[PDB]
Write a protein that binds this ligand. Sequence first.
Ligand code: SF4
Ligand code: MG
Length: 268
Amino acid sequence: KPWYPPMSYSLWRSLKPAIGYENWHCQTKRGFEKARNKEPEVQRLLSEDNQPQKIGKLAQRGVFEFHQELVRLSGSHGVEQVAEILQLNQESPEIQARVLVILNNYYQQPILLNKEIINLSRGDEGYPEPIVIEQGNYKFNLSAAFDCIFREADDTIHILDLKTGQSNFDRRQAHVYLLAASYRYPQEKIVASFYNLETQTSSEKISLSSEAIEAVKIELASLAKKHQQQLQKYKDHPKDFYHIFPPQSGYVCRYCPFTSICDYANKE
Ligand code: SF4
Ligand SMILES: [Mg+2]
């Protein structure tokens, strides 16, 4: 069990705002998700998934089920029985409506039926084992979960992330996925794309030259070091939490999972 500093698309997002979303990025939220998560209040507030999360997880299980018994796309009752496997009758009404829209959307056009599926995840498997990445002499554990892997006719490995809602596409997630994929199919050409199951919209195809791969490695190593330094500082200065993870307050603090426990929450 050799310990190495962690990194993920979630951590990268927690550390750098995406260009164009800088005003909706609060470092104190990262200081709650890491570095204070093991306090009971933070762990409780982090156990409850919002509706946007449960919608997506149900949809991932939806495509998984549609492909476990293929009859559920060839028969006339598939969407209904998949909704039964999803126990969608136990969810709230709005969840049911959104999910049914998405399930019917995949029944109308199953995007992976035409494809040679290497793996289709159920959405409940958690993070795989981390891959150790070596930049310089620094090594860090990258964690990445592929929603789907298939092989194109040209023998290109295609990583597909399945999304729902208004969620845009952060190409940094695709960068994480391409980097992690290179260590599982080292000899193959690898591409990544997004697909929203609720908008039936797809992204273009994303690839990375070797130069861009090393660039992503360098940035991720820098951010892992910074994360560890800040965690160490909070350990060294246990009373200065809001200094080390500085708050950016406002209306966006009505959407934080931690509004109830953040001393700088805007309550307006
Ligand atoms: S309530 Fe606002 S200031 Fe506090 S952690 Fe959440 S986003 Fe940051
Ligand atoms: Mg997904």
